Design a protein around this ligand. Sequence first.
Ligand SMILES: CC(=O)N[C@@H]1[C@@H](O)[C@H](O)[C@@H](CO)S[C@@H]1OP(=O)(O)OP(=O)(O)OC[C@H]1O[C@@H](n2ccc(=O)[nH]c2=O)[C@H](O)[C@@H]1O
Lengths: 5, 695
Amino acid sequence: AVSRA
Amino acid sequence: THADSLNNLANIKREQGNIEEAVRLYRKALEVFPEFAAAHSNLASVLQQQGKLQEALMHYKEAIRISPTFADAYSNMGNTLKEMQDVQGALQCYTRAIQINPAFADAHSNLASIHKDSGNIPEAIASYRTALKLKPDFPDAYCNLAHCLQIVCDWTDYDERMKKLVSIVADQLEKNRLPSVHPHHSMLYPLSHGFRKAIAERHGNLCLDKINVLHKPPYEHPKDLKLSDGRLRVGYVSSDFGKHPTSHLMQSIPGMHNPDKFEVFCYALSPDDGTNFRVKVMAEANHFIDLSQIPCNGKAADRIHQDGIHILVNMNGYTKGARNELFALRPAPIQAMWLGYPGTSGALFMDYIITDQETSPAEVAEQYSEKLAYMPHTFFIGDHANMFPHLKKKAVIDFKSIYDNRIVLNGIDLKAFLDSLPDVKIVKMLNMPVIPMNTIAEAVIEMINRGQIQITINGFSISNGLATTQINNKAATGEEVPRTIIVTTRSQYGLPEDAIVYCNFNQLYKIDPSTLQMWANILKRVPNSVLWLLRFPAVGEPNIQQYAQNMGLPQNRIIFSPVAPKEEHVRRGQLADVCLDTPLCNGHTTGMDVLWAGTPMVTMPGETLASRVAASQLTCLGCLELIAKNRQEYEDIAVKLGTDLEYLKKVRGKVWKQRISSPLFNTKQYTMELERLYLQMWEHYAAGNKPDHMI
Ligand SMILES: CC(=O)N[C@@H]1[C@@H](O)[C@H](O)[C@@H](CO)S[C@@H]1OP(=O)(O)OP(=O)(O)OC[C@H]1O[C@@H](n2ccc(=O)[nH]c2=O)[C@H](O)[C@@H]1O
């Protein structure tokens, strides 16, 4: 659960 | 050749971004020649780009039906299935394309990509290598491979890879074609601020092209607050109202807004994932609209216009789930970048980026397309006060004769448990209770050593910090506040009870050769000490261990733990002494996490927004002594913090107190400041000026 392109 | 000429024109009209005209032409080609496989397949790809995925599939299958060995139709159908979440159909198509033609490089690259997204990095690397071997000039495959290698910290031929990525980008921008470096990644690579801004600009331009098929006039924007009863209507657009770091930062903001002056609309770009994060934003926003229900960007943008939005806030930028097409259509007079995207949009359709003086200094305003809009302390915020209030206070167990970070207890009912115990010493710092080594103390340490889930002491529930998903899975995610007293220890993570623990809990990609060199330099200077990293992913561990052996370090010096549930991650930062921030890209959400544990973080701000966030946090927190102006200063600060034990106790004490006293974690204050700035932005526009810098 992370910020991703 | 009548058919061919239409198709070739359509192909060029497409490369140009003229999507409507490409479609007309491919249809005209098929009118003229129905059995034309390549025009079916080309029309399918442009229908795919427009979001018409069923229609696309139908044309891909027609093309395959006409030419059963048309590998390129299978490869592009694969992508359409992957966009529909049919991972199995995607794989069935990609692999069928490679069976037809094993030298088909595009198919290999597409297969690599779905490998990467699935969590299989070694297979993605292999398949991008295959692609580059079949077609050595292939920018997408090269840059996408450079990202996989970044993720697992493979730095084989790092310096030449870097300059190779820069010349690919130079060369792509010369020709005004879409850069193969994604904007979100561009901070990782030594490109000029000009190139980063242009990368972004070109990706924003895709959105402008997709919306032109709709043929929408400029919308008419309300020029005063008069029909919204004197309230500034603010529209927060995000794919991340659910179990996502964004909600971990800002879920309290919507409901803290002053309803006399503001009216809040949350536009979700994702559907309801069932989590409390979603529930809370839906309950507390004045209006919540599920745009994932309305895929058509013109119809969705209409809702935003009819709601009356003054300020529209873009919380995605170039991240997954973005629908920046919404912002390209300008349904609002003020459109601002906030919080979720750590960079510039590069696009003309964004007016401000909400940031701050320490993150985005006046000098480097050329970094951004947008005008700077300063918050007064940091632009960064965290919902940790609300999420993890059991971490506001802690106690320790004294194993010999006193450490703050060896054996730790947190709990909503910790005061009462403590008061149940015969001997408890308070130590001033305001204060830290110490449980001396009684029978009670021993029972606890045994539960841990035995790997037990929980025990009961004097009626209180005492939980193993490793077992939160078994006791309450909503407390592990940070959706509920834990209702038991939790124990956390260095023993649980194989950390030494008797040495300094430096930490970094970021995804491993933020680490680069220079950075690990500095870490090595620090650890060599502080014997005993260890560096505590995560398996993020696990297959990066041997790369890191090996490059550190080469730098001087024996093996036992770097300890890897698994990625943990959210609450355990934040709780365990308590066991560290110091955090070493990644300078290439800082801990952002991860920086707030470590600070909420009371753990000081050493950082070296760079030029990029992404490399200066931790410095803004520490500024806001008021710990300027943790910010380094160069590499020698970073190692000296960090070594100082690992040898000068009294200065460590002082610095820790400051972080521990200032996480409550400072504005850093003060969502109400942040919200009120956000409000001032929104109104600043509104004044400067109603008095018909256009965006200018606010400071
Ligand atoms: C570079 C970059 O993308 N920056 C973004 C910011 O600019 C945006 O404002 C943020 C968008 O809301 S996210 C992002 O902030 P980052 O620090 O990069 O964190 P990232 O995106 O890797 O996720 C790690 C998560 O795992 C959680 N986490 C971590 C370790 C662990 O063991 N368990 C765990 O739950 C952590 O609590 C995190 O929740």
